[PDB]
């Protein structure tokens, strides 16, 4: 969507929404990654015994 | 007849101005549609329709 806005062929609210969507997706990914890391704190990559 | 001819000329002037404005608007719409297709949000049929309208 960015190039259309560069030439002023879409509303600026459309660019704001897309950028905010990218940021929100990044935050959700961070939440998932930290959850997984929290789970891995109880194993520390050691054998079963 | 003289009065009628005078007013006909004036009406023609006004209609010409209106159609010029219409052409500007349609040209900008065609530009938008072509750019969107190039960026990859529409199909060729939309560009064909825009060209027909222009």
Swiss-Prot record, chain A:
Localisation per UniProt entry: Cell inner membrane
Known role: Part of the tripartite efflux system EmrAB-TolC, which confers resistance to antibiotics such as CCCP, FCCP, 2,4-dinitrophenol and nalidixic acid. EmrA is a drug-binding protein that provides a physical link between EmrB and TolC.
Family (UniProt): Belongs to the membrane fusion protein (MFP) (TC 8.A.1) family.
Quaternary context: Homodimer and homotrimer. Part of the tripartite efflux system EmrAB-TolC, which is composed of an inner membrane transporter, EmrB, a periplasmic membrane fusion protein, EmrA, and an outer membrane component, TolC. The complex forms a large protein conduit and can translocate molecules across both the inner and outer membranes. Interacts with EmrB. EmrAB complex forms a dimer in vitro.
Protein name: Multidrug export protein EmrA
Naturally occurring in which organism (per UniProt): Escherichia coli (strain K12)
Classification lineage: Bacteria, Pseudomonadati, Pseudomonadota, Gammaproteobacteria, Enterobacterales
Originating gene: emrA
Swiss-Prot record, chain B:
Record's comment describing the protein's domains: Forms a continuous, solvent-accessible conduit: a 'channel-tunnel' over 140 Angstroms long that spans both the outer membrane and periplasmic space. The periplasmic or proximal end of the tunnel is sealed by sets of coiled helices.
Family of the protein in this entry: Belongs to the outer membrane factor (OMF) (TC 1.B.17) family.
Assembly with partners or alone: Homotrimer. Part of tripartite efflux systems, which are composed of an inner membrane transporter, a periplasmic membrane fusion protein, and an outer membrane component, TolC. The complexes form a large protein conduit and can translocate molecules across both the inner and outer membranes. TolC interacts with the membrane fusion proteins AcrA, EmrA and MacA.
Subcellular compartments: Cell outer membrane
Domain of life from the UniProt record: Bacteria
Descriptive protein name: Outer membrane protein TolC
Cystine bridges: none
Changes seen on gene knockout: Cannot grow on efflux substrates novobiocin or fusidic acid.
Main function: Outer membrane channel, which is required for the function of several efflux systems such as AcrAB-TolC, AcrEF-TolC, EmrAB-TolC and MacAB-TolC. These systems are involved in export of antibiotics and other toxic compounds from the cell. TolC is also involved in import of colicin E1 into the cells.
